[PDB]
Each structure stands twice: as structure tokens, then as C-alpha cells.
Amino acid sequence: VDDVTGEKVREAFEQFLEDFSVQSTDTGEVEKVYRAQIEFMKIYDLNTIYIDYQHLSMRENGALAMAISEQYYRFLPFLQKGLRRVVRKYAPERVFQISFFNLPTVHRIRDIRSEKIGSLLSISGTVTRTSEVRPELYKASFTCDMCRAIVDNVEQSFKYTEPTFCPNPSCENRAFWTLNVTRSRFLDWQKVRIQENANEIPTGSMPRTLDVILRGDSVERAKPGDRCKFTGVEIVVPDVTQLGLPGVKPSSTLDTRGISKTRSLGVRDLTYKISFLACHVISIGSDEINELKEMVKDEHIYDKLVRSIAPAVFGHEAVKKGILLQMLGGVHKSTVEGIKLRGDINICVVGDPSTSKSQFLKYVVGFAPRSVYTSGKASSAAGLTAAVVRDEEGGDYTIEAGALMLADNGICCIDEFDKMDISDQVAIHEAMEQQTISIAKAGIHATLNARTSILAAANPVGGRYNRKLSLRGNLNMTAPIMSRFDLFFVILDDCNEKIDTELASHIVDLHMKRDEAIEPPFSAEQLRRYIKYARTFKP
Amino acid sequence: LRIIWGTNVSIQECTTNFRNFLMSFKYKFRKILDERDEELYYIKQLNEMRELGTSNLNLDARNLLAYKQTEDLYHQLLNYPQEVISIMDQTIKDCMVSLIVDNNLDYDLDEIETKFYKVRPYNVGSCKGMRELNPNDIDKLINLKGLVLRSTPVIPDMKVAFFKCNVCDHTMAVEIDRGVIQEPARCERIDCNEPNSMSLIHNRCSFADKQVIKLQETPDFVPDGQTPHSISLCVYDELVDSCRAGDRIEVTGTFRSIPIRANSRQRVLKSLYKTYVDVVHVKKVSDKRLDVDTSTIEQELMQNKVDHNEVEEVRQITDQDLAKIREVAAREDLYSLLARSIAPSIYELEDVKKGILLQLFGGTNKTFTKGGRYRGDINILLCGDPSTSKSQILQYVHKITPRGVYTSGKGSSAVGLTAYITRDVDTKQLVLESGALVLSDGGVCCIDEFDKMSDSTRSVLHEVMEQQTISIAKAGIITTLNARSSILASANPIGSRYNPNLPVTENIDLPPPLLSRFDLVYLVLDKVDEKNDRELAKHLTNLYLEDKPEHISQDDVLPVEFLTMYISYAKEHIHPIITEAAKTELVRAYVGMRKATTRQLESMIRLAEAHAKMKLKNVVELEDVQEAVRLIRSAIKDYAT
Amino acid sequence: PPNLTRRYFLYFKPLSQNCARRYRISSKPLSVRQIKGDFLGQLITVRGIITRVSDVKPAVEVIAYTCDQCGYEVFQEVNSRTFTPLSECTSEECSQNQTKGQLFMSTRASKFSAFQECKIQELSQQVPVGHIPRSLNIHVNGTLVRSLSPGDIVDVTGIFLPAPYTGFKALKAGLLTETYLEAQFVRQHKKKFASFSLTSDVEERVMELITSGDVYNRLAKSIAPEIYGNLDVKKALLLLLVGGVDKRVGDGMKIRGDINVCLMGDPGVAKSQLLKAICKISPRGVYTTGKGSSGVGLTAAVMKDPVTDEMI
Ligand SMILES: Nc1ncnc2c1ncn2[C@@H]1O[C@H](COP(=O)(O)OP(=O)(O)O)[C@@H](O)[C@H]1O
Ligand SMILES: [Zn+2]
Ligand SMILES: [Zn+2]
Ligand SMILES: [Zn+2]
């Protein structure tokens, strides 16, 4: 039916692009700049144009986009054809990419159903893996199996198996073909694994995951262990993993009715998963100069910073100072032999239960750019470091994003330090002795690099810390791991009614929804940029 | 005469009978089934539903059992549920249009004709698990009752078999026939005649939505030597995101069968057919226990609202019952009547039962802009002489609470508590399984013999008792989840027969801090004497004197239903903000009782908030501090030593 | 075929030799090892203990294929483990027809019958000297699937039949066969509590039992008379067997009508005769050691079922 509608949509869309230009006069009436946008794109010959949804949907009351979004693929070839026509019209060996960003609506993975097939739809999630760049089959030549006749056409999305037409049709069997490698076009490829985000999970729930694929020059914008906001279309791919499941299974078969006298049935089983594609992704999760200039001029801003890093917690200035200095790393380049140092620093605290050690953890994990909260006990070395795949899905292996492997230029806050196993403490000792790690399995070898600053929570043997004994007799963990630690802290209480009354006052005041008791000098908004500026001062 | 081959079902006769029953049903079951004002039970739903544009409707079985002219429809919807419901999908619209005839309306007719309709028979005849389902009784309306373990992803299915002709600029359309697609190999001979030149595209087609749910069966009777089982089923579109782990369920569906391939290579099948179940309706709540926290599930509420699927998620109220609740709250004997009512079959244990009821109330659920969360839960511990109703109380609490699991002794490990990774028996792929700690996310967690349980397992609870957030770092899983469950467990004394003249904080075989951080503890020492023993003996012997304790209702004991509904409404509707007067009593009580850590302050405030929630107060008041401190001191029995 | 018109299964039961003696055998209680090979299919009665039986499930016996165009059915018969479906139209009307409109199957017309398997393990006293016993498999269908439960003395009856398996394609010489047996009737010397219905004679047994008098202490005396005295302890065992009375609160709780006993004391005096007699006489009995496989042998296990993929 769209043999008529598609070209009209092409004409309307190219008219939309052309009628608008760069007006943007004195930050006034915004006219769409797509003309100059494609011009500036042709400046460097990149062909990866962007599109904004709001400007497209303004004109024509948005009914245009209302129908296009659900019927995106049916018109996409015509959209690209119209873009090509505009390029021919207004500009003087051509492969293109497009994208649509800043969509209004967001759908979680659980908010995707079977009526959004081939429809543009914005999702957000998390990354746990990447894959290998492998050039993909964009165009590819073939040849007749009885002559040199070459065909430079391609069947691209799927059904990549067989063309039919031969320039010289005189052939006993024109059904099948040959292939070729050089007369072809290719473009980048990449695979990742997307994952649920913690702040939007239901109860009794695992982080349901699925796979998404990239294309074109937009690749290299993925990243392990980060939250991202994808945008693309509901591509789907065959699979057989869904066998052995209840209900009846659809099956395809060519017809044999109306034409007769011509597994013989050629029956192919069909059952598909719902993967996703991405046209564009972004990493989710000025007068600042004047703000920081005014801040720095004071002298006790050191104390302001110290006391502002845990208003939710009371006292324990030592913990505040230690956490403030942990994020700052030391210069590890100060050698001449090439043998290097562990530039950054380490921290650990001690204290009986019924204390606010865990509050510092939750604060730092909830504020850190890079960090992770883990169990400390319910975790294997395979979980902390990376346990990798062994030649699965045909392609080669790939290094998994290790948990402890994370915290590059950051922190790995870990609770429950006492109960750690033998192997995991051995692994941590290996990771700490140097700033490098070594892994091996199934014959494969690995070599990584990271400068992790660990802050962990101690748990004495019996909880009670005999004040008259030494640290070793109570800490219960071997000398090397006990060492390498720049700092040790102790947090034990005592009877002091004057201060305990006010402590209970703060605690009970905390049971006043979003009270003003936490009034700090300033907030994480500007603290994070202050940290970023200060991380590279080189004293 | 109109009939279906190998069937005794009539289309138009059934339609007329359905219309007659619909027009004529006025609480007939209240009269025929039993002795128990209103009029036209059914018709109100259909009158009201029209303006809200909903293509769903529920249906009982007792109503057909009651009405004179539906007894035969009973067995016919039983044996042939899908066919009878396909008839009803037309009969309902027939009745709808025949009832609009008596009304003049604005022009809303553009929708009803294009609309569809479907039913959901939910309360139906009972079934005895799956052991009853020998192959004689396959493909029939069925009911069950179990909990949820595992949930799978979305299965698309070919619903519109698009097709692309290679030439002649022509598309093609064809639909499914009993679950298969027969691609027309031809190429529209008129324009072009290529007998096998066509292609297939997936983006064009339409897809269905299906899920698969692993379920644990929980029958009411079992044979000699039974053990738990797992079953698989299939739900379909408009029911997605409805049932998941952590919910007890009574369900309805249709037992079925299906074979499976011997491989991904050819069509050779098994002489044995794998069984399964296809859903018809899911009942998510019941009468014998309260429901989920309402603020905990706001996102799912809004998601279902947007999806226009509105299966029950929270119980509904009546204004007369609300007035009855406000009347019952007027009298002052609530504070002891609740305790007397929780467990009429047991001796007083007044403070124990009062604390149990306050925990069921829960307390306060506040949050900060981005960096705070304080949930309603106060960990409870029991201790004292054995041979009491501690285990009975714990089992009662587990029964009455909706979302909880029971753990016993040292038979447990960190791996089997938090998340653990396993493999499926059919798909043969790495699939996960939720842990018991997270399964109770919101509700009750029961433990017994807390002393002998392994230290490895005892390590994990340090962070659960604080931030209610477990963390996981193992093979292919890195996420921190939520475990809003509550803790309520028993403990055993050091040695045996207890030691009166010794400090009890060191007479338990358990380190100080782990016991101190408990919000509240209760003591069950013996103190043998008459005036507390003969009364108990008669209290418990009169239980057996009758075949079942119905005479126990004497001495001012409430029913379970009104009690539970009151609790649910109070839990879901009121939010007492802390007050000023309580400060000067709370701080002083805490400081004086320090002569043993700051966690008891949190315990006291969270319990006073529950007390304020009781009486339906929207504000705390000084008195709750008094009761809290007095009950804490009585629970630890300060006067003894 | 006439199979789909059959509304009645059949399940034989062999004679009891007590009457075969009258007027004058063929099948005696045999072992998992005394098959002798030549007994493939004959009438046999094998005893032992059932360890694990899978859950009952359906199995086809006759297919119901209906034609889209001809409107006539087709009867595809399968007796092996597997088959291949009939897709193309070989219908009788389609035979005299250029077109061959496709056919399909039915979910209710096609016949079905259950299929459940069980394993025997040899009784202890009949094992030869220093010989480790071995296993065996049986196949069951339809009605009698419910008359089997693990851990009971049994006298299975039927016929021992072969099956298509030849080792695994390397240690083979041809013609090899994995084997099974047919289940047709179950009798067990241990009558569970659920088989209790009175008759014209068992009430008479109870009557003559109670007529003598002193029934309570007489029971306590007859409990394991191989040992001496301790009528009090034998009586305590009797009350353990009785268990008590079940009561339901009806408020979301019940209480056990169950008993728990212990016999603390020094060695020398008889201690294990009691437990052995209890396991011998009481049904659903069990015996365990103190140390050894107590880690999980007293607890739930995880295992994949042989005859079907499942985590039983
Ligand atoms: N009253 C008794 N009459 C006959 N034999 C006895 C008596 N008491 C003990 N015995 C014998 O002494 C042995 C003691 O073993 P038993 O008491 O069964 O286990 P344990 O060695 O653990 O005490 C038994 O084998 C039994 O034959
Ligand atoms: Zn050619
Ligand atoms: Zn064509
Ligand atoms: Zn035919």
C-alpha cells in the first residue's frame, strides 16, 4: 500500500528539511538547521546525520510522526532516498547513517511488547560487556558459476544467501551462485550486553537483560559498566534456545496447492527473540568558574569540605578526612628505573556493631563517579576479578568486565572484611602488591592494569576490641594484607550522656521527612566538579 | 438445530440462555446456597463499565450454580472453556446492544462495534493439584494455588505473515491457520508468474506476547510420601507484568499437552507429551491475609493503569465498613482486644502479642530527595525456656503474613540465601533463581534455632538489618538489590534450664552486639506458680474439649476478616508525622535506659510510630513513648536484676 | 484401527500359588539377578524395593489426523519411542485428486495413555556372598500407575520385554538390547493405613482380639518379645505408633497428634532390637546410622529424572 504513501512521505520530509534553514537570529525564532547540518557533515564526509524529534513533530500537527513512528521501517528506505535527493540538490562512494535523539518517552525493558515492532523506541539500561569489532557485510559481489558475469548487488538485512537474476540467462541452473570478497563494501560492527538499572527494579527480581547491536561510525560510544540511554528500532533475530517450551510452535512451509506435480516439504522452524538496535546512544548517570573562585578564597573551606562529606552521619572527623583524601591519588610516575609505585592510597576502619561505618559506605557509593558496593563474603574471586567466556557463539572470547577490575581511578568500597575467604584475600593481595593483575583459564592468559583505592570495613574476632591487647591479635588476617594499608581507624563508643543526648536528638530528628538538619556548605552538584578539577593539580 | 461436531453446545440457544441469566440474577446464591437489600447482582457491572471503555470482565461459577437456567451451562463451559468463551464474546456484545436499545446516548458507537470482549472465570470448582490430572481430564477449566519462583522473557509469535514479492513492486499478506504459515510460493501469476520467487521480512509482521512462569504447587492434601514439584505454564498479551516471585497465588487455567522436538535438526518427536497449563485468570489476593505495601508498588500500579489491564492489586473498601471501623476505633479497649484476638488459642503473652501486632503494623516509610530511605521494619528476637508457644506463634505469623519464608537451624548457607546461579532443565541455559532473603521483600522472615546456625550464614545479616540491601558479585551478576523483608526469629538459652542468677546479656551463647542491635526482645522465663498455670491448663484443654475451637470466641474475640481489613486500611492510608512533645520523653527514656546502644532509639521511635498508626492517628503523641519504654522494660524485665 | 474405539484398559494379575497347589508353579518371587536371560516375556513375579519413580505423564497410542479438504480422518499408529509426522495429503479422496490439501492433527480425538517407569533393587537376604546387587527397570501405563510408592516390599507381576538399544556405538557387536518389564498388578505384604475398609471377617478378627481382654498390656507384651521386660518401654513404643489425635484451630493453625520418645541409658542392655522390630512391623519405617551420610542423606536432594527432563 505504501508504494504511494512512502514517496509522499519522502517529499514531505525533504520539503520539511529544505523549507527550514539556519535562522536562529538573536536566539529568537528557531528554524531547523538541517541544511547547514548536512553541509557541515559533508565538510568532513562522515554521513551520520542527527535528527531531533521535537522539531520534526512540530509541523503538520505531529500526525506525520504519529504514523511514522509505528511504521518506521516501511518508510525508512524512502527517508534515506529523500536525504540523498536533498544532498544531490544542494551539494556536489556514498553510505549514510541517521539517528533520532531526545525522544519524549522512556520504556524499560519490561515496558516493551509486541506492538512496537519496527518502531522507534527509547530505552535506558546498563552495560556489562562489550564484543569484538568485526567488519560486516554491507554490499558484496557474486559471479555466475559458468562465466565471469559479476553482480554488485546485495541482500543486506537477512536472507543473505542467494540472488537469482543472471545477465546472460542462458544457463542450465541459474538458481545458485558463487561469491567474491573484493568488489564489496563494509562498515564497522560491535556487540554489547544491556542490563537493568538498580533504581527501577521490582521485587523478587533479577536484572533481566538482552543483547543490542551497533552499526556505522556511531560505534566506539559504548562502555562496560555504565548506565546509558539507547534509541533505535525493535530488530529481532532467529533463535532455537526457546525450544522445549509449552504451546504450539509456528512453522513455515511453501505452498503446494494450485500447482502440483512439481524433507521434501522444505519446512523451516521459526521462533524469534526480541533483541534491539541503536541508532544513537548517550552516557547517562559557565559561571562554575566564578562559583569555585569564590569558594577557594576562604581558608577554613578545608573544614567545610571535611564536614560536608557526611552530614547524614555524626562526628568521626577522622573518617571524613580519610574519605576526602581517598579520592585523591598520588603521583605514580616518580621513578627513573621504570619500576613503578602504587600511587593512590588505601583505607580501612574498625569498630563494634551498632556503629555508622556502613553509612560512610552507602554515602560514598551513592556519590562516587566510579564505585561498587559488594558483599565482601558472598562473592568468589571469579566474581571480583573477571571470569571470561570460552569461544561461545562462534566468535572469539572477550575479557569480562571484572567487578574489582572496575574502580579505575576510583574506589571499590567493600563491607564485611573479616569473613573473606582465603582465595579472595590471596587475589586481593596479588592486586595490591602491584597495580597489575594476571589471569588465566583454559590456557588463555590475560594482563590488566588498574590503580584501585580500597576502603573496607573491619569486623574484629569477637566484636569486642580488647583495648589492652595489640592490633594483630584481634584483627585476624595475615600480615601482608594487614600491611600496604596507609591508615587504620578505630571507632568504639563510651558512656558520655551530654553528647549522647544530642546524638539521639539528631537520630530522632532524622525521622522528619527531608528536614533541614543536613544543611551543608554546599552539595554534590558542585562537589563533583570540585573533585574533578582537584584530581589533577600535581603538587 | 445448530451444534458443533463432537459437541453438545448450541450458539444461539446458549446466547439466549446467557442473556436470560444476565437479566435475571439477584443474589440468588445468598438464598439457595445459604440463609444470608440489593438487586440485580450482575447487571451493575455491565451498566457501569460502558463509559470507561474496557474490554474485560470477570465471572464466577457459584452464580451459574445458583441460577435455575445455568446448571447445564456449568458443565459446558467446564468441558469446552475456549469454545464457550468464544460464544460468550459475541453474546456479551449482543446483550450490550440489546440493552442500549432502551437508552439514548451521545455518539460513542464508533468504538463498541470495533471493540472486542473476553471473560475470566476465576472462582471455580476446586482441583487437587496436578496428581489428579490423568489424561482423561485434559483441556479443561482448572484451578490451583501456589507461589512463584522464576519468570522468563517475552516470546514473540507470528501473527501477521507479511511477505515481499521480489519483483512487480507488490507486497503480499497472509494469516496463520491453526498455528502454522504456508508461504504462497507463487508470485501473483497475473502480474508475474514465478512459482517460488518471494521473500520474508520480520519488521513488517505483527507479533504476539507470551511468557512462561515456573510455579511451586502448594496443595491442601498430599499422599503418603509426597514432595514439592515445579510446573510451567503460559500467559499471553495484556497479562504481562502481573505475577512474579514473592507472591502467593490462587490461579485458574486449562491443563494441556504438547510434544517437543528431539533436536534442532529434523522433525522426530517423543512418544511422551510434555504437559503444561494455559492461563485464563489469576487471583492475586485472598481474604485470610493482608496485602502488599501500596507505596512499594507505585510504578507497577501506574504501568498497569497505562496498559489498561486492571486485575486486582489492592483490596477495595466499603463506606459502611469504614464507618464501622471508625466506630470500633472509638472504644478504648482496642489496645488489649487486638492482643486477645491475635491468638485466642494461647495464654496471654500480652506484650509478646502486642509487639507482634505492632510489627504487623510496621510503622514509617520515608525517603529523601536522593540519598535516604527509612523503611518500616523492626527486627524482633525471642528467648526463654522451651516448651512454650514460641514456635506456634512463629508459624502463625508465617501463615498470616503474605510475603515470607521459613528457615530452620543450620540448614542454610550464604549461597542459598542471597542470589545463586543454576541451569534450566529444558532450555539448558544459564538462568538464575531468587534467594529466600529477597523473596520476602516486604513482610516477614522467620528463623528458629538462631544459635546453632552457621557463622558463615550469620555473617550476611549485618547489612540486611541496616540498609535492607544485599549485594552480589559472582559469575555474570553484578547488582545490588532490595530486601525490605522484616526479621522475626527465636533464640535458645545458653546450656539448658537457664541460669537465674547470671547476667542474661552473657547467658545466651551469642555475642553482645548481635543481640543489642535487635530492636526489641522478649523473655519467656518460667516462674512456675498457680494463678498463672491452672488458667492456662483449662484454656488449652477446652480447645480439645470441642471438635474445633469455636466456643473459644467468647471473652471478646474479634473475627479475622474485619481485623485484617482494618489493618490493611490503616497501613495503606495514614502517615503519622513525628511530633514535638514525644521528644522530651523519648530522649530521657533512652538516656536513662542506657544504664545498651543507639539502635534501641530507632527501635523505640519505629514502634511508637506503629502505635500512632494504631488508633488511626495521623500524628504521634507523648503517650506512645510511655507505652514503648514501659513495654521495653517489661520485655527485658528490668525489675529482676 | 480398532484401538481408538477401546474404552477399557486391561491389567492382568497372576495366580497365587496357594491355589495352583490345589489340583496342581510357573511364577515365584525372583531376583534382579536370577533372570537367566531366557525369561524374556514369560510370566514372572519379581520382588524387591522401589527407589525412584517418575511422575505420571501422557503418551500417544493412536494419532488423529483430519483433512482440511477431504474432511476425512487418518490413523497413524506409533508404538516405538519416536516417529515422524504425516504432513502431505495421502487422503483417499486426495488420491483421486490433483490437489492434495494439507492435513493436521487433533488434541482430543487422538488416543492417549499414561506412561510411568519404576526401578527395583534386590532384597538383602537373597544376595549371594559378598555380592553387590544390581538394578532393573519397568514400564507402566494407565490405571495402575498410582499403586506404587518407594520404600515398600512389592511383588511386581508382568512380562520382561526388550527395547532398541545396543550399547553406545563403539563397544558393540550388533543385536544388543536394553530391556524393561511390563507392570500389570501390584501386591505388597505391607498394607498402608489408607487400606482399612471393613469386611465380613476382619471385624471378626478384631472382635476375637478384643474378647480376650487385657488388650493394652497384651500389645505391650507382644511388641518385640525377643527381648526381656521393659513393658513400660514397649507400651511407650505402642503409644508412639498410635501417635495421638489431630486437632485444627481453624484460625490458621493446627497441632500435631504425634509422639516423640527417647530411651537414654547405658550400654549392655538391649537397645537396637526395639528399633529393628519397629522398622520390621510398622509401615513407612526407616532406619539410619549416627554418622556418615547425614550431611544430605536426611535432607532433600536435587537430581534430573531419567525418563524425562525435569528437576525432581
Ligand atoms: N535383655 C536382653 N536379652 C537378650 N539379649 C540382650 C538383652 N540385652 C542386650 N542383649 C544383647 O546385647 C546386645 C547389645 O546390643 P544393643 O543393646 O542392641 O545395641 P548397643 O550395643 O548399642 O547397646 C544385643 O545384640 C542383644 O542381643
Ligand atoms: Zn549465468
Ligand atoms: Zn513479482
Ligand atoms: Zn485429503
Residue numbers in the entry:
A (entry chain 6): 103 to 194, 260 to 429, 441 to 463, 510 to 763
B (entry chain 4): 177 to 212, 221 to 779, 793 to 838
C (entry chain 7): 193 to 216, 220 to 507
Please, what does the article write about this entry?
Eukaryotic DNA replication initiates from genomic loci known as origins. At budding yeast origins like ARS1, a double hexamer (DH) of the MCM replicative helicase is assembled by origin recognition complex (ORC), Cdc6 and Cdt1 by sequential hexamer loading from two opposed ORC binding sites. During S-phase, each DH is converted into two active CMG (Cdc45–MCM–GINS) helicases, thereby initiating bidirectional DNA replication. Cyclin-dependent kinase (CDK) inhibits DH assembly, which prevents re-replication by restricting helicase loading to the G1 phase.
Here, we show that an intrinsically disordered region (IDR) in the Orc2 subunit promotes interaction between ORC and the first loaded, closed-ring MCM hexamer (the MCM–ORC (MO) intermediate). In MO, the MCM ring is closed and MCM subunits are primarily in a post-hydrolysis (ADP-bound) state, very similar to the DH11. Formation of MO requires Orc2 and Orc6 to bridge the N-terminal interface between the Mcm2 and Mcm5 subunits that form MCM’s DNA entry ‘gate’. Orc2 contains a long (235 amino acid) N-terminal extension that is predicted by AlphaFold14 to be intrinsically disordered. The Orc2 IDR has not been resolved in any ORC structure determined experimentally, including MO. Notably, overlaying our AlphaFold prediction with our previously determined structure of the MO intermediate places the region of the Orc2 N-terminal IDR (amino acids 190–231) into a contiguous stretch of density at the core of the MCM–ORC interface, suggesting that it may have a key role in MO formation. CDK-dependent phosphorylation of this IDR blocks MO formation and DH assembly. From these experiments, we conclude that the MO intermediate is critical for MCM loading when one of the ORC binding sites is of lower affinity, and, therefore, that the essential role of MO in DH assembly is to stabilize ORC binding at weak sites after first hexamer loading.
